[PDB]
Symmetry: D3
């Protein structure tokens, strides 16, 4: 590989919690040059279609600072048109966070997740999912510690990774060059207990076989395991009770 | 199932070509109550980033008439905000059509695919992919017959189907009620030669196992086979040469 | 005329009711190559300025699929700017439907009319008015049959036709070439009892005389009569009681 | 009538030319409380579809200051959505100006007409057409005087008036109360030589007869004559040569 | 100076009240060729964040007719994007009006200020502030005279002027050419009692000294005094009681 | 003061350069809880109105992540309307950067400055100006080091600070509570050589005196001096030649 990384090998991962002071939960996560600030903020209200239904909600906002992929990514603000890509990813991130939380026990409140890509080199949405989880878990633990809620209703860890087929090679965690050069690429969202939350595989003018898909899904699930092993070092859990470990930062030894 | 259909059974499928006179290719396809007008029109130009590169292009526009799911689906016109869902599906449809055509041999022109959902009851995007293929193939055959291009550069058939897990049952081709009630659901885009172009599986606050995913991918590939067997009755192909059969309409015998 | 049609002669008209299953009323109407899907759906509510005023409402949405006039008509969605033309026609269609119904007796509900032009070759808005009436009448008859309302409060038939002056010839029902080549053209919306609901005459850089206008208004009213004679074959009316005839389709014998 | 005006009687009309210094042509016209600033500015260019075609163009922009009809008319700016009504009227005004000018002889330039309603009490679009003509004529006369063009290619005067049926009375030049209370109302755009440029008649949930339409078209044409007699006092024309009279202001004696 | 005006000399100022009939207050103010219609209209309501708080509000809308600076200033309507400049000025004008009124005593109602630039040649926002005050004062005096409110809660006069450094000369009240050619320019909003409400000084790629700023602020305050002396001729005030003088128009003698 | 800070005392300032790898220049600057990522990226092109004019350009984009002031600041993306506040600040930041650079010597290229507020507690735009300068200087030094340009055409340091009058106290560098509670507040943009680039003072329904303004401008200029003394520790300059010092981070000793 370009950067001398093995095919079934992730880039250097780094997750730093308590990145910012104001949000209930926050972290700066990085997969190589890809960097994402993930924050979780509690809004003491709920969408209207949920009112009175004894449940909370989680929603996500994603944004890519104009300086991404060492190119230009002008925001959906001072430009006009609003990309349907940003929404696709926001919906993804929201779906991952919601799958991981028992919203029943969160109360009639909303956790507003914000993923700000401050540097892009491929895999920015999976890095955002992986980091967003940390921020959401921390925010729920914070809410508990503040007595706003009884327990810490977090179902399981959640992480994501990309995998692709490049020049007929199956690669894990693609940077931006490998991804643009890919025949087939995909995104997997998995849980701590080894299950899956989402898998999107797309042929880029090339088609693939069911078996190629399984090979990829297998390498991805291994990537999710490594990412979740990192995430696990930040918590001390017992019988569904979540507390933060004393680590403020975890990183892959590579 | 609600409608008395088996679990591994599709709804009544119907594809009618030559639905309209003006487009090079067009059809009305239906999966049960879900109905979609698919048209393919040739625009004698190409996007700017493609100019001079000796290649053609295919792009898709999708729209859902205000009367969908027996509810309201006001267009992205007299409303303002533009859904990122419509774009997700348009990109999908475009990716499927492009995978199926050798754009190199189409010339510096663009095939504009339009999918108009005139009635929605689940699986509207897969019905659109299945129908869009027919319209695109017909348009390429038309272009050939008009002498605009030498051959009929169509690589293979392309169809799509949805599958899901509902009350722990794995169901094929979900209508709107089964889909809203689903724990896990997915969309598969496959080719005539049995390969895959795209697969998107999403847990709806439930997670699934790799094996459950394979079971689903297996039922889906069988659905794609049936859909492609229908599509095949509309063409007579030999050594990469495509002509239309004399059928103007094909339907599953159910 | 280009198509060998007399000057005071309409193109082949065709109206097919029950085109779709979900809407209370629906039809596919065609004036030559111009084709429009017209549906009428009941929304169990009313605009706010009408609440509590013991009255119902009718509103229309019009849209022209990207493949119109064998050219490009990209929707007011994935483009941005919203044409003031679409609104002009929607307001027109709404005004025609409302003139024909005694909204007092419809209840505090709204009939949402949707006109989807699936093929355009001139006269698409008059075809939409003519077809929209059928869909609205059917929807009111349906509402009655479902016991939602007591009577079938339809005041009279409503249809529309275009007429123009081309190379100093006064022509009825203009296709797209005759219209672009016209010095003066107009749209008339008339009722079954021979009255008028709307008439818009526009000089296209040419001016006309009051007498030329009367000649045109006269030919148009004859076109409305023929269109209404077709529409009449679809209903059996007596003392303000409306039922559908057994025809599912009516067409001009030409 | 509310204001003691006869039925076939206009409100006090006033046209003041040279209202502003910067535009080639400009005036403040008033029909009762309805007041409109009309300016005509020359832009030394043409729309792209006209380039090289040896012709000029005229286009109009209409706007209604937030304080109209003694109510609120917030602009299509700090609100978002853009009304399809403003466009309907802009297209109307542009069509009237273009019908009156021989664009062939104007050169490859554009006359930008701006109608700013500074006070609204009915008939604001007809007042704008009547006033816009004065501004356009003046601008063409100015262009001639500056030697930019050879002749003053103005075909004829152009004015507009509204008429309606209120409580079964046919009234000329409706203010805002008469218009809201009208069963039928219309707008006529006529020329100096007694011809017509545009006529739009709309039943407001009431239908009318061809003869009622003629009665209205007759009263309107008389209103156009009076308005054009005022406009004529501002020019001295001979053999298609236009010069301004010494009047800076003209008003109906009432 | 270009127009033969001294450096510490304003252009000819003119303020005409009762410009229009419908608004509670209105005037046409002019600074040289720069002309602005300023109207004040009472809306019998308040923004939601103010409800029940026993206070009124003042908000402003600013717009520049397409014919400004003898160039093109197409509105924020039939263009799309909405300038952040118009908002900057609207907020400014609103802040000036609010500083001058004791909103506590105005009641739970809103004064809607509209500034319509009908001709631009520099200093259009300061002319708008100066004129808007007159319209607001008149509207409050009107409200009092109609018995809607007890007193006339106007704190003090408010006016504005621009000043700049051009070719190292400090000039008062810049027209459009002096402003575009300026190294430093600013806007001051002052009160009758000689105080300040707002001051914005901007280096245009040139920086300035604190002392240069004071020199400018000094010339500006003198310009505000002259403008307020004009404004004062339109009112007769005593012990916080405001009545209009018999002047309908005031102008600088120059 | 709330946080025990003196009145003429800044919050703890921190500037970290080389914050990110991809941009030519970048830093994370902080004024208390207010934190802003400032990046400078070179775009090898120029706006059209500048082409061929032998000059470069600098433009800025500002954005406030949804989690600001421990509240909600949803971007100008998935919301619709685009704030005129963001533009006011972007224009400000661009004006400050341009005043500090000799664009003549930068070449026909553009420096794209991006200020991303990742945490807001008052003074976010002044923190952005102060930090943006560092990123721009670094980017120019980088461009020089890469041989793209001959010299390092930076005219002088540029920094900004806010000051206000709160409960009649004149305070330097206001946090969010002091600012909302302020009678008068302002923003000053000054240079290393002690000059000024911009000063905006606004009465918040209170007016102030010229002398109060001078007192404030005096405290602000002292704040700019301290901020510039920090900035200076990051560079080693001689005869207009700029190199970076070995500091990667500088902070006020407080």
């Amino acid at each position: 590989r370009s950067d001398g990384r093995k095919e079934d090998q992730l880039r250097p991962v780094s997750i730093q919690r308590d990145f910012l002071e104001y949000p209930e939960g926050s972290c700066l996560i990085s997969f190589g040059k890809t960097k994402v600030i993930c924050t979780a903020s509690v809004i003491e209200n709920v969408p209207n279609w949920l009112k009175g239904k004894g449940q909370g909600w989680i929603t996500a906002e994603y944004s890519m600072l104009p300086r991404a992929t060492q190119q230009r990514t002008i925001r959906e603000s001072v430009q006009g048109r609003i990309g349907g890509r940003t929404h696709e990813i926001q919906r993804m991130i929201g779906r991952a966070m919601r799958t991981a939380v028992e919203l029943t026990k969160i109360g009639e409140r909303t956790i507003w997740v914000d993923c700000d890509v401050i540097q892009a080199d491929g895999g920015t949405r999976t890095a955002a999912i992986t980091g967003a989880f940390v921020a959401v878990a921390d925010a729920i633990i914070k809410l508990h510690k503040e007595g706003i809620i009884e327990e810490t209703p977090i179902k399981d860890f959640v992480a994501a990774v990309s995998v692709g087929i490049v020049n007929d090679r199956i690669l894990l965690d693609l940077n931006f060059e490998e991804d643009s050069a890919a025949q087939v690429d995909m995104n997997v969202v998995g849980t701590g207990s080894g299950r899956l939350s989402e898998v999107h595989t797309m042929g880029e003018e090339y088609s693939f076989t069911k078996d190629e898909l399984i090979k990829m899904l297998d390498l991805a699930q291994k990537g999710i395991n490594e990412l979740i092993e990192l995430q696990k070092k930040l918590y001390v859990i017992q019988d569904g009770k979540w507390e933060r470990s004393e680590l403020k930062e975890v990183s892959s030894t590579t």
